[PDB]
């Protein structure tokens, strides 16, 4: 089943739009106690919980598929992860689901240093490269991240001992209010070019933004969640993916909800408005269709919420967050390349390149190396706009070492139903707005990974929030 | 209300049996037909029961004790929760943290360690006559050093041989470590360890196993180590850092209240089971006093070390029988002491191998303003805390001789407890590789679920919840609707 989402390029086809996905639901409709808006992990979790608990639930989704900001496309026997990819057993909510759905043994490691070039390629200007062992890479990143995170003498353990409760130590607020650039400026004289370049590339990989617009405290939050170490981060952020792709995982939620007999759904159904009435809420599609339920779980992403009409009017904090928007404009490009030895390659090309961080991520059945490449707002490319330029950015990660057989990507920035990649905050945004983003709104429960407490911005945060939403609805409806 | 479980001692009152707990359920019964019977109201049974009742199943919970919680429960004594068994939790523990967050208790934790005032040192005792004192930074360094040597069997402290701890056979080299004892591993590195390194190492690993150096699986420790992030700090974070402000019984109550609130929960406490028999369309569960209960499926959460007391029909597999015969090795003695030294809030100690309590920390301050110490003993130098109060007081005092007097002791003897026969699961060499599949296996209409044979945080509160979640899933799949 082909989605409208996604792009693929090959020499023989050029650039084409729309790729297959297990996430595509057919037929698109099968038609209420609850309406759930959005079929990403947050909506899937809420819907699964609610239907299992006995509630008649209508899921309305703008796209032709489930998964939202995370979905996979199987092409020539290999799953390409268009958005959210990596998971770990230190991520409570996603791991709980993985184990309950018995997919704990269905993971693959992204890193494999068993053969090939077995090096990290650091490029700090367009004309040269520095190569080092993965051990040296580890040491370099450890050194730079130590200096970056050591605001309190314990790399964040003192100012942020309980990352689920950011104000537990009052002084954390000042780090939430700090930009990446402001922190770098404090340690600048203590960083070599190699340290600073790898550091900036890594922290911008995480934020998808710029040094000026990314919150230092939010990175400290990721760091803390991961165990306050570089290896903790690598383990949680980039180590383990589904063998069969994320869309296989999303299906499990879908199949369970569907099996209850209490699931109604409409795909290709973008909501334009949500109005609170007496004892119920009314949801209206762009095309005028109306749906009514006792409660609504709205999972529309933060960067998309300004397109919706709510009455009653949303709070001041909700509006300010929505209008400012989060900063992650990550470009994620998959390249299937003809260099077999690059399975064990990693690269940082910064700041001159429109893709700044990349890894060997797998081998396709055709025996080609799969590279996953990441770009941010500091030097941004829209991968769809000019494939020649996209290929150039890919190539410049390791000039003269490979030819590209395939590109696969989804443009999250230009996606009207995402308007950005995963949540990453501006300085001060989380401390100022998190409470407002999580607050009650009559018959509407606002739930999205964007404003979770723990693994905020992760698949895990989506599930945390969907679980909360279902709990709220169940308690309110008795 | 007062449980039959637990002990307390004060100079004024002497030793008394039975302590209060929010885990005590009154009235002890509210009673079919029954869709499911869940045997045991520990975290495994509570999770299964909550999931099942919420999913619409008429569920009967049968519990031997007068309380919920099983191997984890708290007693509030003069406003302080004493953790009788399972205590510590962390957000790197998937199943317990999921429950904590969903019940909105993520902000209801307290840190055990507080080094902001007081003696602020680690006291290492390797013989009865002297002590070595060091900073907690030096303590960290000592343990990091010793645990590095202990765990580095593969050059990466376990990451190569056990990359996926939920799948122990992923790498073939792991089985030989599961089959290795603590003593066999130490023998491979003995010449590389100072007395201080080996003493603190052996204390720490025996803290974890509750067993002996000879009967404790090295691979099982490597499993804990891996689950925790393959570092000493990961271990400390996951094993001993954060507890519930209001005690574990407050957490257990949340599961109870949700299950009860469905209107689909039947229950009987003080109802020990003697047999479970698979019949044609149902299973029959019979109590010690002869009462019979019938349901379509049974979730049996009776612990491994207690299973041999139960009569099953049909007979169990060789693997399940052999595990329940051999038994797990954790005979941990856990003793709380409310003490008169205020400065010991920031104290930690290891006294090894000469003391019957080996590992201890300052864990809190009671409302009365007294330091709370928690003390742990293993099977290499074991004490039954209820046998002789004076011997128990002696063991406590020898952790820091001449520094404090004891105002109160609080403990439960897990070893002699007929419904536990041991503390948390910890395996003999080769036991998990040989028996884990057997222990997890279907048995007609009976689902065997317990932390003792979980895949991830096996032996933890987390593992109990993992297993309870699996059990409800199996039942819902097999029964439908
Ligand atoms: C490129 C990229 C890489 C990532 N990498 C990782 C990773 O490695 N690991 C990880 O854990 N996470 C990763 N993330 C994070 C990510 O996957 C998300 O945070 C998570 O999936 C969000 O789930 P959600 O349900 O909360 O939101 P979404 O998934 O965005 O779901 C909500 C969505 O609501 C719908 N919607 C929007 N507007 C309307 C409307 N008007 N009407 C109806 N429906 C509407 C969307 O179409 C529907 O699917 C990544 C994300 C991206 C984009
Ligand atoms: C001293 C100690 C310290 C611990 N420390 C920690 C810790 O810090 N953190 C952590 O996560 N875990 C810790 N643990 C682990 C521990 O809490 C358990 O692994 C977990 O609680 C077990 O849950 P369970 O449900 O699987 O088993 P249990 O809790 O044992 O529950 C099963 C039980 O079934 C019942 N039963 C037994 N026989 C019968 C019968 N014949 N008929 C009816 N019912 C019967 C028991 O009474 C009932 O409660 C500790 C355990 C102990 C003892
Ligand atoms: O997949 C992505 O794009 C983000 C960035 C690195 C980890 N996850
Ligand atoms: O409470 C206990 O006894 C176990 C041993 C140390 C960590 N938790």
Swiss-Prot record, chain B:
Enzyme kind, highest EC tier: oxidoreductase
One Gene Ontology term of the molecular function aspect: monoamine oxidase activity
Keyword tags: FAD, Flavoprotein, Oxidoreductase, Peroxisome
Region listing for Disordered, in residue ranges: 1-23
Compartment annotation: Peroxisome
A GO CC annotation given for this chain: peroxisome
Disulfide-linked positions: none
Biased composition (Polar residues): 1-19
Pfam families hit by this protein: Amino_oxidase (PF01593)
Cofactor: FAD
Enzyme Commission identifier(s): 1.4.3.4
Principal localisation: other
Catalysed reactions listed for this entry: a secondary aliphatic amine + O2 + H2O = a primary amine + an aldehyde + H2O2
PANTHER family linked to this entry: AMINE OXIDASE, AMINE OXIDASE [FLAVIN-CONTAINING] B
Family, per entry: Belongs to the flavin monoamine oxidase family.
Protein name: Monoamine oxidase N
Species in which this protein is naturally found: Aspergillus niger
Name of the encoding gene: maoN
């Amino acid at each position: 089943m082909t989605s409208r989402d996604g792009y693929q390029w090959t020499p023989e086809t050029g650039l084409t739009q729309g790729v297959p996905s297990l996430g595509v639901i057919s037929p698109p409709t099968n038609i209420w106690d609850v309406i759930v808006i959005g079929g990403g992990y947050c909506g899937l979790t809420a819907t699964r919980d609610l239907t299992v608990a006995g509630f008649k639930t209508l899921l309305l989704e703008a796209r032709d598929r489930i998964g939202g900001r995370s979905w996979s496309s199987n092409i020539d026997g290999y799953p390409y992860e268009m958005g959210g990819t990596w998971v770990h057993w230190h991520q409570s909510h996603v791991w709980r689901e993985i184990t309950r759905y018995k997919m704990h043994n269905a993971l693959s490691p992204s890193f494999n240093f068993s053969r090939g070039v077995n090096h990290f390629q650091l490029r700090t200007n367009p004309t040269t490269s520095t190569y080092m062992t993965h051990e040296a890479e580890d040491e370099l990143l450890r050194s730079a991240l130590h200096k970056f995170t050591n605001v309190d003498g314990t790399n964040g353990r003192t100012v942020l001992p309980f990352p689920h409760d950011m104000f537990y130590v009052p002084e954390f607020r000042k780090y939430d209010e700090m930009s990446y650039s402001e922190r770098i400026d404090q340690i600048r004289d203590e960083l070599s070019l190699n340290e600073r370049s790898s550091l900036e590339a890594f922290i911008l990989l995480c934020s998808g933004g710029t040094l000026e617009n990314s919150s230092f405290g939010e990175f400290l939050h990721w760091w803390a969640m991961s165990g306050y170490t570089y290896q903790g981060c690598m383990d949680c952020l980039m180590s383990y993916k589904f063998k069969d792709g994320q869309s296989a995982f999303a299906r499990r939620f879908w199949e369970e909800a569907a099996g209850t007999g209490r699931l109604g759904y409409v795909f290709g159904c973008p909501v334009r408005s949500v109005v609170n009435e007496r004892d119920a809420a009314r949801v209206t599609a762009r095309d005028g269709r109306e749906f009514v339920a006792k409660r609504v779980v709205c999972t529309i992403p933060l960067n998309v919420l300004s397109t919706i009409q709510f009455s009653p009017a949303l709070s001041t904090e909700r509006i300010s967050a929505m209008q400012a928007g989060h900063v992650s404009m990550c470009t994620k490009v998959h390249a299937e390349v003809d260099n077999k030895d690059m399975r064990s390659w990693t690269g940082i090309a910064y700041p001159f390149n429109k893709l700044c961080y990349a890894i060997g991520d797998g081998t396709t059945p055709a025996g080609n190396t799969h590279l996953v490449c990441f770009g941010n707002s500091a030097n941004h490319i829209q991968p769809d706009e000019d494939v020649r330029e996209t290929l150039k950015a890919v190539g410049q990660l390791a000039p003269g070492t490979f030819g590209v057989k395939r590109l696969v990507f989804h443009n999250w920035v230009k996606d009207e139903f995402a308007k950005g990649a995963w949540f990453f905050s501006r300085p001060g945004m989380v401390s100022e707005c998190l409470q407002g983003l999580r607050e009650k709104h009559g018959g509407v429960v606002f739930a999205n990974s964007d404003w979770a407490l723990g693994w905020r911005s992760f698949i895990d945060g989506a599930i945390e929030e969907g679980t909360r939403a279902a709990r709220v609805v169940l308690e309110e409806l008795g």
